[PDB]
């Protein structure tokens with residue numbers, strides 16, 4: 001699709017076998033969800049946003065179904081107020097900014 | 100341009116007559132700079148994201164140029180770790196996210 005930016009750009013994704021909604025965020029390096037169940041082991045990570053740092057669990061090499069593609073990669077989980085799809089995921093579906 | 104997202108999507112931006120750089124950020128509602136000085140009065144605003152909240156300085160009616168498109172927009176000034184171009188400004192230059 002071509003997404004204009006008059007409203008927040010949300011997409012539906014499947015993660016952990018559940019349908020979730022997340023914000024396409026080209027200013028986020030990483031993909032971050034709250035309240036989901038990922039496979040495998042995780043390691044602790046801290047992420048620094050506009051207001052300070054956030055403690056998360058990092059799950060490497062897990063699947064996200066997004067834009068009709070299986071993307072395997074890193075997903076962070078923590079008490080973010082909004083689920084976000086970052087560049088780590090968007091590069092795998094060939095997303096671009098066009099201006 | 101059509102840019103990919105393997106690196107952070109910084110663009111050159113002229114804001115209030117100063118040459119700066121900022122991230123094209125689809126997850127940002129508004130444009131926020133840390134390293135500019137805009138003249139006159141300002142309205143206080145609170146904004147929030149990962150890690151917490153910050154107080155910013157709302158400056159109204161500010162000239163902004165990106166990739167040759169000159170627009171007049173709202174710019175927030177505050178202690179953001181990285182300058183961001185938000186959706187308000189991106190809609191004015193006709194930017195889209197594509198996949």
Ligand SMILES: COc1ccc(S(=O)(=O)N(C[C@H]2CCC(=O)N2)C[C@@H](O)[C@H](Cc2ccccc2)NC(=O)O[C@@H]2C[C@@H]3CCO[C@@H]3C2)cc1
Pocket residue numbers: 023025026027028029030047048049050051081082084086124125126127128129130131146147148149180181183185
């Ligand atoms: C009202 O206008 C604004 C309000 C908040 C923001 S924000 O910077 O907090 N943020 C809002 C996103 C996050 C929450 C939401 O619902 N939308 C814009 C983000 O793109 C932000 C922009 C950003 C802010 C601070 C540092 C780097 C980029 N990136 C970000 O938080 O990424 C996280 C932090 C980690 C560093 C970058 O990637 C890692 C994942 C920007 C404008």
